[PDB]
Design a protein around this ligand. Structure first.
Ligand SMILES: [Mg+2]
Ligand SMILES: [Mg+2]
Lengths: 297, 504, 500, 299
DNA sequence: AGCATTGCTACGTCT
DNA sequence: ACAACGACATATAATTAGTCACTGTACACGTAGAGACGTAGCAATGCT
DNA sequence: ATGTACAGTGACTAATTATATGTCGT
DNA sequence: TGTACAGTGACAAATTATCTGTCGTC
DNA sequence: ACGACAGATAATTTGTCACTGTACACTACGCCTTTTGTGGAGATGT
DNA sequence: ACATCTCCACAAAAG
């Protein structure tokens, strides 16, 4: 009955194409969002080129339930602040069930055209692609929160959907610890620990707090595709995966780095190497054999 | 901290399937029957579902998935025998002793009998006791090193000073290794493997120059690689090059191992002359920048050639000596094609964007000056101290010499420079105003006609005294003019000389 | 041809259980009606069920399971590039060359550029194509050999003849191994690893004797092993042995590695004088009855001793020369105790019924004759085509000699026998009635106050002549008496003749 | 109903204690058989120390389906003519697959025992230590046919037990070749082919027509424990297993060895080797170490 | 007168 | 009769071929050769 | 904080294409 | 039919951790 | 309800024994370089 | 009658 009872999870594919930092054409991202039933409030979002499998929804859960920390680059007016453990969740593999179970809320899986109507559908490259994925992250959290969430609802227009949701919480929305919500993260596995507790990830190099005790061992990683600047490392066991430490990206030139940016860095590094002509490096190979073809003992 | 469930077995999925059904909000008037409709599909009594939901709340998904017994991995032989087994294996593998578990178990048998213990542990337990110890002793072999990353680099001197390598030629590095090809004389008989010497830019990571030859690691070999590296490169159409080895100029520092050739006075005097400091690495690991091109050569070149000898005694091909056919001039003509057209054109493995030569040509503060090659040679010549003595004579290695101004300087020590390949024309230097000044070429009297190498001048002098002969310019000449009266060292040197003499 | 179904999956069990549920017989008109339950159970039309019945009634469990595809293991690059890859790799790895799949891919790319091929095989395609070759040549590396079983055995010889082994002492074997122990002189500098040469009874798998020493593989070493093998054994109370090494007596054959001392004249002289026939080993494997005890003895003994040196350079433990601590008067005692109190009583690996020792004592054809010790010390090394002088005098290796009975003979071809370790005297032999007969014992001129060995007298002759000294036994003896081998030989001087 | 219509499996545990072919006590066997529920005759039968289980049941089922024969030491006056699949096999998951392979219904969840147990076995000197599982073969396989099945019951048409069988067919079974149902045999998961096609099994060595080409590869065996003197070698595919070769034991004194005898033969070697008076042999190891510990380093 | 034997030196060749 | 094997055209999906980011691992002077015992070159120191 | 870096690997993914399916067919 | 010992798989015997009952007031 | 008595039951280790992969196949302390303090004349000066 | 310096030849560690 009350707002915050059943949480809807929605998907769409954004008909705006993007360009990469170095000018490569990106795809069109999928948008996934978590919204109330009885308010129209938006409480969670993820956007990217990952297909709307269990991945983007598992992150969009994590997005909502934690405290909504935000950056200055967003130029936000409003604190989003929408923490709170859900209790029912509703979506279009099974992994969502394990999360719902472990977090103790029923998952009983089987409106975005508001942004199709809005000028959002007219930014460059809609429907010269002069925008990138980090720019969408900064602007879209703002243009949703400060404008599409804080405004008066389409019907029951006596309340803004945020405030209809905020007062309607059966008591007060309760945040919960961050580190227990790692199951919602991405996963990478069988990474190997180098001298001093070191790890490679996405062509970057990482180092841990106490990870040097397990050099030569192998470990799994989890991360957000929004800032890989520190990623969680866990020791694998037979039926338990135990969190060991954070590990910190090293040698990067910025305070923040999205996964898409590590892909772009690699893709520029890779695409540079692809342009080098082997013409000399190749012709010497047949000429070495044509010489050795004269050998007889 | 967080414990994550993974690899849930299917009965744990059944436990999940009830838990995800009980997650529907319920009360005592609803729990009892909504539990019982699960108990029937668990097919076990209600109280077990109570303990299941208890453990589920107590620990989550890792509560409903069973944890191995407290006894797993812990032995029942007890504290005395667990120690005695591990004590005995541990003492048996220090020094070169290599006592394996079976010999330990045989000790355990002896120990129980003398202990009057009627139930010694079986060898399977002893092997299971040591299995984790053996694995810990194994893992130590595998632990990987991260390596340096990006542009910024330094090299770890045994002085304890990390020398930053800020630009091209800032530190060159040099080492030698035995090539894994058996060579042959031009007549085709086996010549034992050569030595390869490499000089490498630590930035840019170009190979700057090499010397390939049968001569063992020696300051004259070092000096020979240094000459090639510092000088510009020219190669004729018999080298079918498509690239060009456009690298030259002096290092600012020179980084080495502790070999007696590198720790030689000769090399340190070259460094003082040419203008670089000589630094030694702590250990070979710090040398990896130069140790590694050998393996990239070993894999990509020497292994694909007739008579590859294999990197180990356990790995020499069964017929390396049968297949041996390349000569020193032929292997060098390939190795130069590899370095010019291939290795230096590959990406630098830190950088990805830049070929090893483009990371050189672009990374020079200024294009080096084209060194006058006689000046390089003059400061590559080794040198000794002797005093001009009466009549302007000076002795050096039993020979006597003089030159156009010597006798005026009779009575004091002079500095003179000599090339072990031809000692017959010494260059002699005075020190005046505490500065070095050239006097003249001192020619070996009566030998100003054809070259004499230092090695026979030593070896003749050793053996000629078994004849009781007087040692003099003419008698050592008389001991040289009939050396045509063949053997490996003759084969090597005549082949090794015969490679370079095409230069013009 | 029988073929059996394997890896029966859950879905195969689902498909099987419905098949079994329609294996129960009924009239065909209801048969075609009760099978309709399969339709939603399999989510497919009954025409597939009719096909499934046609498979199962034809093929059993094998055809009820899905096959692999027709293109499994077939490379879509086509026969040109798959030929090209396997051609290039095998010729690139002939002889000592060792090309690798990465090097092959460079050849593929090179040839494609020549061919103007728009899409040549990727390196991982080239790597895949070679995986069968690498695996097939890997399995060919490690094939176990069955080995002989039971009492019957025969040993192949380099002659091609195969010689049965029928009773204990029928066929002895020997070879030498370099011991994996660094061991040291008195007080003890590192010296070097010794050699071990062993006599092995091919019937009993027993071991009748060894020679352990720094001496290189030489006929004097083999002879001194046989001197140990053939004689009765007595070891001093300082060994404190529990068991007695009761193996003695003489071989009817000596089967051996083809080493130059085993092929020597001296040993062949022993063959004639003791009656065994020397037989050569064809290839090392045929030696296994003596090759393997080096492995057994390395593992159970040398690996536990301080100076252990590992099985190879590539495994050589760096502390070996840092704390080598045994001398050979200890390593002898360790090796002798290991043989006599353990190895002799150890079970023979394919009999089980009895120790190594009892298959000797029960297996010999009859009790052998225990020969006089002096008779083997008459089986000395001999020299021939020499001549006696026309007088009471003789010569050998620039030594000069006297003999009590030689004056009854003119200068004539003579045969003579000598102890290389006591060349102070010679035994002289004559060819009477085409048979060797004793002339006399003989001595170096005036030599009685001291004793001389052959090796030091040979070395002395080099420094004697090169100095221009007047050649004689008088001057030669001085160059004997006026170091690695000195330490080694003076260790070997420690001998049971002073201790028994 | 018919003599091939409905066959029922049965089992018993024997009340006799056995000694090996040397003279040591083994156990009391398990015993199992199938009986045609139409004719009521005892046909396929298995005896041994392996306890009743799907492998033993399947082995006795082979002993029913396959044409029976006897060795030259029996040449018995009475014999089974039983062979072929039933329409239904009764023993009331592995037994489902054999039925699905051969095409007969498998059911699982008056008996004769007293005609042997009380009438014969209780009379033997070893009844519940001085007869052997080679001998307890004929002391069953003879009497079960030469007396029991040769007996007549007027309760079922006044004919010998097997005469009703061979009379009672709606269509007479054809014999099935041995090669058609190795699925009833034992299994060995891995064996390595040694050089020259040799293969060790049960401490014996085997060789066979084409096995040497598989040297250095792994093969599976199937075998009959009543005589292991033949074994069958199988090669596993992606999801099939193909009959590779037969193989024959080398170096046997007598070409009849059973699995039970090979175990007891190998237990002789084990007991002989274990008889070593090793306690006098340990003195080497402790005094070798004492010597090496007496050598202190020079520095 | 003649050689005739005696004590080195290869050049393998093998472990 | 109609439930038996064809005749499809179209999915269905399991094969191969290709892209990448990881990582183990040898590069660290090292076996050509010591050290026996011939068949065959030799000198010599005798002597008839 | 950082030895070196290439060949071989794994974990997918795009393209191929072998062949399972559903309907009609006789 | 090389030799054959140390290490290892599959299993049975023994130990013993802990989890399943029938239960008692909560 | 949960959890709390004594005892079941799925592990856990202890111990057997058929099997097999491997070394034994002799083959590192040895080749080569450089420094260097001690030592023998032997021209020359005192 | 003496003292002096100089040039050339041998044992210990590292690759
Ligand atoms: Mg070096
Ligand atoms: Mg040998």
């Amino acid at each position: 009955d009350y707002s915050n009872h059943v949480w809807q999870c929605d998907h769409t594919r954004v008909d705006v194409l993007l360009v990469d930092q170095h000018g490569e054409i990106l795809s069109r991202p999928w948008l996934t969002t978590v919204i109330d039933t009885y308010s129209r409030c938006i409480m969670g979002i993820n956007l990217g080129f990952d297909a709307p499998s269990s991945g983007v929804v598992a992150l969009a859960l994590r997005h909502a339930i934690l405290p909504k920390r935000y950056g200055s680059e967003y130029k936000l007016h409003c604190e989003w602040g929408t923490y709170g453990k859900p209790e029912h969740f509703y979506t279009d593999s099974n992994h969502l069930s394990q999360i719902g179970a472990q977090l103790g809320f029923v998952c009983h899986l089987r409106p975005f055209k508001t942004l199709n109507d809005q000028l959002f559908s007219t930014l460059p490259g809609y429907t010269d692609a002069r925008l990138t994925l980090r720019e969408l992250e900064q602007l879209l959290v703002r243009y949703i929160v400060d404008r599409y969430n804080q405004s008066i609802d389409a019907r029951m227009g006596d309340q803004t959907r945020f405030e209809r949701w905020e007062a309607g919480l059966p008591t007060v929305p309760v945040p919960i610890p961050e580190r227990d919500l790692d199951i919602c993260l991405m996963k990478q596995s069988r990474r190997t620990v180098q001298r001093g507790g070191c790890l490679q990830f996405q062509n970057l190099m990482y180092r841990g707090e106490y990870l040097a005790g397990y050099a030569g061992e192998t470990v799994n990683l989890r991360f957000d595709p929004r800032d890989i600047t520190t990623i969680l490392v866990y020791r694998q066991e037979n039926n338990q995966e135990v969190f060991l430490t954070r590990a910190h990206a090293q040698g990067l030139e910025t305070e923040q780095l999205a996964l898409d940016e590590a892909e772009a860095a690699s893709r520029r590094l890779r695409t540079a190497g692809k342009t080098i002509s082997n013409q000399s490096l190749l012709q010497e190979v047949v000429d070495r054999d044509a010489l050795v073809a004269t050998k007889k003992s | 901290k967080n414990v994550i469930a993974t690899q849930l077995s299917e009965e744990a999925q059944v436990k999940l399937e009830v838990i995800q059904s009980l997650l529907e909000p319920c009360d005592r008037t609803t729990y009892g029957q909504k539990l019982r409709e699960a108990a029937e599909k668990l097919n076990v009594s209600l109280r077990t579902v109570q303990r299941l939901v208890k453990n589920w709340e107590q620990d989550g998904l890792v509560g409903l998935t069973q944890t191995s017994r407290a006894d797993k991995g812990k032995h029942r032989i007890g504290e005395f025998w667990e120690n005695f087994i591990t004590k005995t294996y541990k003492e048996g593998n220090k020094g070169s002793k290599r006592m394996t578990p079976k010999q330990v178990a045989l000790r355990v048998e002896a120990k129980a009998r003398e202990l009057k213990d009627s139930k010694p542990p079986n060898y399977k337990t002893v092997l299971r006791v040591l299995a984790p110890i053996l694995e810990k002793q194994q893992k130590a072999k595998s632990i990987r090193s991260p390596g340096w990353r990006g542009t910024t680099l330094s090299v770890k001197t045994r002085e304890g000073k990390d020398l930053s390598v800020d630009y091209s030629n800032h530190v060159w590095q040099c080492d030698h290794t035995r090539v894994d090809v058996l060579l042959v004389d031009q007549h085709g008989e086996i010549l034992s493997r050569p030595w390869l010497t490499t000089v490498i830019d630590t930035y840019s990571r170009c190979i700057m120059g090499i010397n390939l030859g049968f001569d063992a690691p020696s300051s004259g070999v070092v000096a020979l690689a240094l000459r090639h590296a510092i000088l510009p490169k020219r190669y004729g159409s018999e080298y079918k090059l498509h690239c060009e080895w456009g690298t030259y100029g002096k290092p600012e520092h020179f980084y080495t191992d502790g070999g007696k050739d590198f720790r030689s006075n000769h090399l340190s005097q070259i460094g003082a002359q040419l203008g670089f400091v000589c630094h030694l690495r702590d250990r070979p690991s710090e040398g990896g920048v130069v140790e590694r091109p050998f393996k990239t050569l070993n894999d990509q070149l020497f292994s694909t050639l007739p008579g590859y000898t294999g990197s180990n005694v356990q790995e020499r091909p069964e017929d390396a000596e049968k297949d041996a056919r390349l000569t020193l001039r032929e292997l060098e003509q390939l190795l130069v094609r590899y370095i010019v057209d291939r290795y230096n054109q590959s990406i630098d493995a830190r950088m990805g964007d830049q070929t090893r030569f483009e990371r050189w040509e672009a990374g020079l503060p200024t294009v080096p000056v084209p060194i006058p090659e006689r000046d390089l040679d003059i400061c590559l010549m080794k040198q000794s101290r002797r005093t001009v003595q009466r009549g302007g004579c000076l002795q050096f290695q039993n020979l006597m010499y003089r030159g156009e101004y010597l006798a005026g300087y009779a009575g004091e020590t002079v500095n003179l420079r000599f090339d072990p390949r031809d000692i017959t024309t010494i260059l002699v230097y005075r020190q005046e105003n505490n500065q070095e000044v050239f006097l003249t070429r001192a020619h070996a009297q009566g030998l100003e006609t054809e070259q004499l190498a230092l090695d026979e001048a030593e070896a003749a002098s050793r053996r000629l005294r078994t004849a009781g002969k007087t040692i003099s310019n003419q008698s050592l000449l008389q001991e040289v003019v009939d050396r045509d009266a063949k053997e490996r060292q003759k084969l090597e040197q005549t082949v090794l000389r015969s490679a370079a003499v095409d230069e013009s």
